[PDB]
């Protein structure tokens, strides 16, 4: 059901949110990462994000809780609704296009260590119509 590689990739996502590396995601850490990803959620919006996943109730998300939600979302969310949500993270100004500059910001934000050239290559590979940027449909074709 879950290989070690899938588990470590789910840990890579968990680690981004648990910035102090103590095995727990707090609101403060959830708030910090969500703001770096363009968003700006409400203080209530952060405690019920934490809440919907914190299954034992200690007010915090450990990796077993996280791995349980990710395994369920992987089985429940449809493949198209999946990417739409990711696109909206990339398309930081909501104009319907992911530019190289927008992709660069997410790459640096998620601690990736890519060259400006490599990001350009990433855009090149998904750009199907040649306008130098990535729309929603182009994103789904690469992501699947």
């Amino acid at each position: 059901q879950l290989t070690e590689e899938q588990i470590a990739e789910f840990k890579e996502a968990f680690s981004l949110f648990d910035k102090d590396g103590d095995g727990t995601i707090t609101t403060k850490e959830l708030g910090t990462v969500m703001r770096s990803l363009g968003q700006n959620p409400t203080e209530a919006e952060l405690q019920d994000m934490i809440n919907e996943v914190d299954a034992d109730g200690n007010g915090t998300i450990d990796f077993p809780e996280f791995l349980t939600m990710m395994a369920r979302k992987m089985k429940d969310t449809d493949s198209e609704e999946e990417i739409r949500e990711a696109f909206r993270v990339f398309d930081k100004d909501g104009n319907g296009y992911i530019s190289a500059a927008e992709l660069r910001h997410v790459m640096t934000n998620l601690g990736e260590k890519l060259t400006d050239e490599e990001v350009d290559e990433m855009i090149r590979e998904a750009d199907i119509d040649g306008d130098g940027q990535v729309n929603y449909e182009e994103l789904v074709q690469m992501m699947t």
Partner: peptide
């Protein structure tokens, strides 16, 4: 939600790096 979208994005970067 926002947790799974983040996984999807890190996978996109992963897939590219293998090329």
């Amino acid at each position: 939600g926002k947790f799974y979208a983040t996984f999807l994005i890190q996978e996109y970067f992963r897939k590219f790096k293998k090329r």
